[PDB]
Amino acid sequence: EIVLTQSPGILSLSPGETATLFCKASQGGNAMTWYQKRRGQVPRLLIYDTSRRASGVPDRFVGSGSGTDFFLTINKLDREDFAVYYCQQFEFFGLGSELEVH
């Protein structure tokens, strides 16, 4: 079974900067998906097919990567962008990351 690994994860930063979370797969060849969950709300789709953005998505979220290694990079951090993030290849799932205000 394909297991995803999440990297750094617990990440505390200030507004106005850029940040990047990392994920690595146990099996290459497939695509990638990124999900945002805020506090006490319903999760929301950011990135499907490893580079494409959904509706209601500003383009300052940029996903990239190849093979097994994928990066999610947000430039120009805002207050609403502090949330929990998930990587997704198939029915499998990764553990998540944490964006906190520093």
Partner: protein
């Protein structure tokens, strides 16, 4: 627009049965899959199963087999051919099932696959004690 509606929250005794409706409105129901997924604290997400309502063809996960059942009810009239009802049913309840459940539908683009679920319900919290 696409809209999903889940049911109200529930507390159950151990070893009980729970039936959860997921009502869909705003699109032609006979053309899209419906997936069921769960969310436990300190667990992340965990996929349960998927159902196509054109013939009700289902599939469940392997580690949850024998304990779940998915049915559907279509809309049969030439007036409102869009709305539809999915039913999930869960038996053999344990205290580890303390979680929140969600029914989802995928995105509707060209390179949209099947697993990138776009539209979500508002989630039903289930407590077993």
């Amino acid at each position: 627009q696409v809209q999903l509606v889940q049911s109200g929250a529930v507390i159950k005794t151990p070893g009980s049965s729970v039936k959860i409706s997921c009502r869909a409105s705003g699109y032609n129901f006979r053309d899209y899959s419906i997936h069921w997924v769960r969310l436990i604290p300190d667990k992340g997400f965990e996929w349960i199963g998927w159902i196509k309502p054109l013939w009700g063809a289902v599939s469940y996960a392997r580690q949850l087999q024998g304990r779940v059942s998915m049915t559907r009810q279509l809309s049969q009239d030439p007036d409102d051919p869009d709305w539809g009802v999915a039913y999930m049913e869960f038996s053999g309840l344990t205290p580890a099932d303390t979680a929140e459940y969600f029914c989802v539908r995928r995105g509707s683009c060209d390179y949209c696959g099947d697993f990138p679920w776009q539209y979500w319900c508002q989630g039903t919290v289930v407590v077993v004690s």
